[PDB]
Subunit: 429 residues, 4 copies
C-alpha cells in the first residue's frame, strides 16, 4: 500500500531519463519502475519531466517568503548561508536562536552552514556537533592566519570550508578609484572587479586549504580562469569542488548595464566572451553545481548608481526553469547531467544522503517541469519579500508545474501553495 | 504479475549498495524497491551481494567458453575479432561466425570488428552489421594504416581498441635473451619493459587524436601506462583504458613459481608495480577490468617461458577473484566494483541494455556470497582445457547464481539448469 | 709580435658587440681589447661587423657536389667550420674504413675546416666505437634508416660512448603514403606537397625519438625543425630536464609555401617549408631562445633531379653560401636581434653542443675564424655568384641587405669580396677525443 | 702604456677559465689575452684565480665598516637596500641626504635600490630619475593593492621590483604560538616559519607582478619549493629572477641550533635535506645569484632565546671564500658558473653595464683567490662594526689575497687597506 504513485513522467534517474513510475511511502521513494501496484493516490506526469528537485547550496535568507519563492522555483532543499543574518550562525547558541525564530515558517527543507569567522575558531566544534554541513568564510572575515588555523580545524572535524574568493582589497580600491573618476556604469563596476582578483583569491585559498588538510568548496566562480584553477588543483589530487550561478550563464555585462543595479553582484557578471567559456566549463563537467546565491534586499538599497548600490541577485525562484531552458532546451544538455548540476552533486558534496536523486530510499522530493512552455516573468509572479528581480521581463522557455517535498505537493502552478509549511531543518551527523 | 522477484539481497545500484528488491518481467528489470508485490518465482538473496552481471570487454573465444563465463559471473562478453580462423574483418566474416555459433551461446555477446591492413575499405561493413568497436595491433597495421583506419572509424562513430606494445623492441629483447640463455619469468618480463608499453601508448594516443578517433587502450600493465592515458584525457581527448585481474592479483614472483600459464603479452610486473596499479584503480583512472581470456592447448604452454605461447586462461575467475581482492581485501565500495566490472564497459561500448541494475535494463545478475572461500581446482573449470594460473588459489567469495535476461543459467547448486539462451548483440 | 691585428670593427663578443681590436698569432686569437701593439699585418674593419665564422652543424657535400666547390661556397658564405653529414656521400661514413677513405679522397680539397659526424645505420651498431675512436662529434640517423629497436640499441651504445645522436624526425611512412595519395589525385602542387608532409608527421616523430633516446640514456639533437609545434616538444622535454637541443634552417625563416610555389622545385625540401603563419611562429621561437642553432642543411642536386613536377623532384635546398648574409639581414637588420644573439645562433651554440672547443667564439685562445659583414649594404644574389658545382639556388634573385666582405680561417683570409680566394685550400678535418 | 697588467692568473672569463693576462687603463679593462706588452705596473697572479669582483645585490649598511668588510670579502660592487635605515631611501631628498652622509666613506662601489612603501607610490619616479637600479618592498610593507599599484607604475618606468616573500602574518602567529608553549629552540623557530609560508607569498607576488606587468626579483629563497615556483613562472614566460644566500647552502638547522642567535635570519635556515635540494637547484641554474643579505646588529639584540633575538646574518666578509670553497672546491662547480652566480648575473639583472664581467671595456674590478689554502675565521679577522659572525670558527678552504676596484688594490691580505676610500655611488639611466 504505497501512499502515492507518479506515473508517465519522463523521470530523471542517475544514468538516464525514461518513462517509469515512482512509488512513495512515508515521504520516501519506495520503488521505481513499471506496474508498481496500487496507492492511496496517483498523479499523472504525462508530458512532464520529473526532476529530483533542486538543492540550492548557496541560499541567503525572511523564511516565509524566501522558502515560498524556493518551492515555487522548484527548490526542495536549500543550504543556508551563515553570515548576512541578524545573529550570525557561528555557534550552537546563535544557531538555536535561529531555529526557534524559524519555527513554522519553512516551506522547504534546509541544511545549514556554519560561519568561520575571526572569533569563533575555538567554537567550530559546536556547529559540527549541532549538525552543520560546512563552514563559510571570506578571506565578518578571517585573515590568512585565521583561515589556515580554522581550515586545519575543519579538516580535523571532517568538515569542508566554503569560501567567497575575491581579493576584496584590490576590488574596493579599484572601485573607490572609479568613484573619484565618475565612472559608475555597470561596465566600470565590472572592470573594478577584474578576473585576476578572482583568480588570485582562488589560488591563495586552494593552497592554504591544501596545506591545512581541509576539503574546499569554491563559491560562485564567475570566470573560466577561476574554474581552471579549481580544475588544475583537482587533477593534482586535491579535494575541492566549485559552483557557479544562473546569472553567470544567462546574463552578461551589456545586459547588466541595460538592466541596472538589479544585476549587480559580488563576483561580477562578465562579458559574453567570458560567458561562452563558462558554458564550455559547465558542459565539460568542471563546475560541480549551480546555485542561486539568492541575495535579496530592500529596493532602497538598489537605488543610486551601480557603484553605490547594494550588491546581490534575487533569483531564487528562477534557477530551475531558466537553466532547464538555457541548458537542456537551448543548448541540448542531457537530463541526467541537469539533475546532477541542480541537485545530486550538491547533495553528495554536502552529505545530504536523503536528497538530490530519484532512487529507492531517498526523500520523495520532486519538481515537475513542462518543457516547451514559455512565459514572461513579471513582478507579480515573484514570491519574494520585494517583487523585484533582474529576470523580470525575461522569456523563460519551460515551466514548473508541481513541487513535491517528502511526498506532499507544496507548490502547484494552479492551486498555489496547497498546504501549511511542511519543511524541516536538516542536521547531519 | 512479475516473472520473478529477487528479495533481501544487498543490491549494487548506481551510487549505492542497498538491500532492496528487484522485480523482473520479460527478461527485463521491471522495478526496484520495497513492497514490490509477488511473482511466479521468488528468490531470497539474503546475505548475498547482487551485482550486475560482468560485462567483459576483452574476450577471446563458444560452448566451453561461454559456460566458463557464466560460471564466472559474466553475462555479456565483447568478443575479439583477430583470433578466429576466418578473422572478423567484414560482413561475410561475421555472418559465417554467427551461423557457426548457432545454439552454443550460454551468455550474450557483443562484437568487435578487426581493423587490419587489408580491410580499411570494408570497415563500414562491420559498422553496418553492428559491431561496437574495432580492435587492432600497431594482421597488424603500420602507422599509416592505423591513421587511415582510425580516421575512417572516427567518421563512422566507432572507437578503436588497441594492443599497445612496441612489439619490435619486445621481440628483439626476447630474442636477445634466448641468445644469452636467459629464460626465466624475470627475464621474460625484463624483455618486455615498461617503456615498450609507454612508447606504444604515446604513439597511438597522438595518431588517434589527429585522426579524430575515439580510443580505448587495451590491457594496461603499468601505472606509467595509465599515466599517459590520464594525461591525454585531461587534455580533453576521448580515451578510456582497461586492465586485467592478472595485473592486480599476480606479480612476477608468482609468475615465476606458477610457470608458463601466467605468461602473457604485456607482462605481469613486480609487486611494486602492482601496488601502483591498485592506486590507479582506486583513483578511478582505469575504466574497466577485463579478462583478456586467451586459452590454448597445453602443448603450446610447455617449454621454457620464452618459448611458451602467451595468454591467461582466467575467464571464470574474474569476478570472484576481484571481489575478494578489491572489495574484501582492500575495501572498495560495492558501487565502484559494479562500475569497474560492468557499468563502465557498457557505457563505453554503448550496450544500453547492460551493466546497470536499473529500471528497463536487461535482468542480468550475479549473486555473490561474501566471506566464503574455496580453492580453485582443475575440476572446477569449464574451459576446453582445464588449466589456469589461478588453480590452487584460495578465493574468499563465491558466485552462487548467474542470471541472464531473467533466467538462471548457472547455479552453484545445479550447474547449468537451462539450454544455452545467449544471443549476439548488434548495435545500430 | 702578433701576426695579424683586426682594428676598429664592431666585434661580436659573447655578451655584447663592441668596437675593439683583435690580435692574432699562430692561427689563434692572441688578444682582444684596445692598444694591442703592432702586427705583421693590420686589417681595417671600420664600419664592419666582425663575427665568429659560422659553424654549420648540418652540411651535405656530395647528390652532386664535392669538397672543392661546396667548401668554397661555404667560405664565400662566411662559414669557417662545417660539421659534415655522413649518410649522403656514396661510401656512407659508418666506420673507420669508410671515413679514412673519405679523408684520402678529400686530400688538399678543403677550403674550410670540417668536423665529422658518423652515421648510425642498421648494420653498424657494433662498429660505433670505431667512429668514436676516430673522433666524430655525433652520429646521425633517420628513424639506410634504423627501426625503433636499432635506434634504441644504437642510442644506448652512443650514450655509453658519450656521443650525441642527431635525428631526422618525420614519420616517413605517413608522408610517403600521403604523397602517393596526392599523386593519384593529380595533386602535384607545392601547397599539395606541403600538405602531404603535415605538422603531425614531424611532431609524432620528434615525440617518439625524444622518448626512446631518453630511455636509452642518450643525448639528442633534433635536426631541422620546421614547425613551432615541433619546437614545443623539444622545449617541453628540456624543461623535464632531458639533454636535448634542436636546430632549424634559414629556409624555414625566410621562405613560405607561397614563395615556394613561385620558386619551384629549388625550394623543395624534406621537412617542408610551411606557411607564413607557421614562419611567424618560428621567428617567435628563435627570438625566445628555443632553437639552439641555425644550419644550412645544404643539399645540392643535379639539375635533372630538380626537373618535373614538385612531387617527382628531388628534395633539398642549395643555400650553403646564403645562410650568413640572409639571416644577418632578416634577423638583425629587419627584426632587430642583438649581434651577440646572432653570434650564438650561427656559431657558438653549435660549437658548444658538439664540443668544438677551438670554434665559434671570438675569445682568447680560440681559432681566429671570422667573417666580416658589411651592414646596410645590399646586393642581389645571382647564379654567377654561386660557387656550388651547379649554380642554382632558391635564393637567387633575392635582394640581401648585407654582404660578406671577408672570411678568415685560422688567421688567413680565405675569401675576399674583391679578390676571390687568395690562398690554396688550407682547411683541415677536425677530429675530437 | 697600460696602467697595469695582471699576469699568469687563472682568469674567469665568460665562457671559460684560462691563464691569460689582463691589461688595465684608466680603471677599465683595456685588453685581455697574451703578450699584452708593457704597463706602468705589473702584478703576478701565478697560482691564483682572478675572478670578477663579487656584485652583492642584497646588502644592508655603516659605510666605513661595512665597505671594508665587503672589500676584504672580495666584493667590489654592492646594491644597497632602502628600508630599515635612519631616514628611508624612498625619494629624492632621502637618497640625496644618503650621498652626502656617505661622502668619503665608500671603500667599494655601490649601486642603489629605492623602497616601494605604502606612502610613496606617487614619488617612485623621483628615485627612477636619480638612477636607482630597482625597488625593494615587503609583502614599511605594502598590502596587495599598494603592491599591485606600485608594481604597475614600476613596470611603466622600466624598474624591477624586489620582494621579501614570506607570509609575515602566519609566521608571526606560529612564532607567538611557540613562545607561548615554551618552544623557543632554533628547531622551533624554523618550524614557526614553514616552507609553505614562503611558497604562498612567492605565488601571490609572482601572479600580481605578472598582472601588473612588472619585472620581478625574488629575494633570498630558502627552499627548493620556492625556487620551483619561480622556475615554473619563468617557464611560462614571466620575467622573473631570484637569489639565495650562502647561509642557506652552507648551514642547516642543526648547525643553527649549535651556533645560536647569530644564525637566526628571516627566511629560516632549513634542514640538511632542504640544503641538498638547494644545491641541486643551484647547480642546474635555477638560482640567478648569490647575495649576502648582510644584516649586522648590536650583540645586545642577539642575546636571549632564538624566539626573541633579532634576525640577521653578519656574513658580508665571508660570501666569496666560503662559496668558492663549497661550490667549486668541494662540489666541483666550474669557475665560469661561479663568476656568473657571484657577479655577472646580478650585474646583468640590474643593468650594471660596467660590472660583473672580465671583458674589454668593463671596470677593472677583480678579486684574487688562493685555492686550497685554508684558515679558520676568527672574530679578529672581521672588519664589521661588531666583530661577530656565525661563520667564526669555520675552516674556509680558500683565501682572498687581493681585491681591486677600478684598477687599484683596495685590499691586500698582507698590507690591509692601502688606499683612502675610493668607492663611488653608481646611478644608472
Ligand atoms: Fe559571495
Ligand atoms: Fe553569497
Ligand atoms: Fe593483446
Ligand atoms: Fe587479447
Ligand atoms: Fe634531413
Ligand atoms: Fe640533411
Ligand atoms: Fe629580507
Ligand atoms: Fe634583507
Amino acid at each position: 500500500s504505497f501512499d502515492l504513485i507518479i506515473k508517465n513522467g519522463t523521470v530523471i534517474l542517475e544514468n538516464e531519463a525514461r518513462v517509469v513510475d515512482i512509488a512513495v511511502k512515508g515521504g520516501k521513494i519506495a520503488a521505481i519502475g513499471q506496474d508498481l501496484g496500487d496507492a492511496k493516490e496517483v498523479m499523472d506526469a504525462s508530458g512532464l519531466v520529473v526532476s529530483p528537485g533542486m538543492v540550492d547550496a548557496h541560499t541567503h535568507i525572511g523564511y516565509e517568503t524566501g522558502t515560498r519563492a524556493a518551492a515555487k522555483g522548484g527548490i526542495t532543499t536549500m543550504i543556508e548561508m551563515p553570515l548576512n543574518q541578524l545573529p550570525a550562525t557561528v555557534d550552537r547558541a546563535s544557531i538555536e536562536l535561529k531555529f526557534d525564530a524559524a519555527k513554522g515558517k519553512l516551506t522547504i527543507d534546509a541544511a545549514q552552514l556554519g560561519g568561520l569567522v575571526s572569533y569563533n575558531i575555538d567554537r567550530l566544534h559546536e556547529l559540527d556537533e549541532v549538525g552543520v554541513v560546512g563552514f563559510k568564510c571570506f578571506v565578518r572575515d578571517v585573515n590568512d592566519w585565521q583561515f589556515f588555523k580554522g581550515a586545519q580545524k575543519l579538516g580535523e572535524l571532517g568538515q569542508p570550508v566554503l569560501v567567497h574568493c575575491e581579493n576584496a582589497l584590490i576590488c574596493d580600491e579599484l572601485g573607490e578609484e572609479a568613484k573619484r573618476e565618475g565612472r559608475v556604469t555597470a561596465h566600470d563596476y565590472v572592470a573594478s572587479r577584474p578576473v585576476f582578483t578572482e583568480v588570485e583569491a582562488i589560488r591563495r585559498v586552494l593552497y592554504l586549504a591544501k596545506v591545512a588538510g581541509c576539503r574546499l568548496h569554491v563559491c560562485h566562480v564567475s570566470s573560466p580562469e577561476g574554474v581552471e584553477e579549481v580544475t588544475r588543483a583537482r587533477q593534482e589530487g586535491q579535494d575541492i569542488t566549485c559552483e557557479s550561478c544562473p546569472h553567470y550563464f544567462v546574463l552578461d555585462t551589456d545586459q547588466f548595464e541595460e538592466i541596472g543595479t538589479l544585476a549587480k553582484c559580488s563576483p561580477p557578471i562578465r562579458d559574453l566572451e567570458n560567458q561562452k567559456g563558462m558554458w564550455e566549463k559547465l558542459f565539460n563537467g568542471e563546475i560541480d553545481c549551480l546555485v542561486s546565491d539568492h541575495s535579496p534586499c530592500p529596493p532602497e538599497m538598489k537605488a543610486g548608481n551601480i557603484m553605490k548600490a547594494w550588491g546581490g541577485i534575487a533569483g531564487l525562484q528562477s534557477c530551475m526553469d531558466v537553466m532547464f531552458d538555457e541548458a537542456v532546451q537551448k543548448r541540448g544538455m542531457s537530463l541526467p547531467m541537469f539533475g546532477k548540476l541542480m541537485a545530486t552533486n550538491a547533495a553528495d558534496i554536502f552529505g545530504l544522503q536523503q536528497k538530490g536523486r530519484i532512487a529507492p530510499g531517498k526523500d520523495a522530493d520532486f519538481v515537475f517541469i513542462q518543457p516547451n512552455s514559455s512565459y514572461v516573468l513579471t513582478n507579480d509572479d515573484l514570491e519574494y519579500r520585494h517583487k523585484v528581480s533582474p529576470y523580470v521581463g525575461r522569456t523563460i522557455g519551460a515551466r514548473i508545474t508541481k513541487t513535491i517535498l517528502r511526498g506532499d505537493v507544496i507548490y502547484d502552478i494552479e492551486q498555489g501553495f496547497p498546504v501549511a509549511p511542511k519543511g524541516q531543518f536538516i542536521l547531519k551527523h
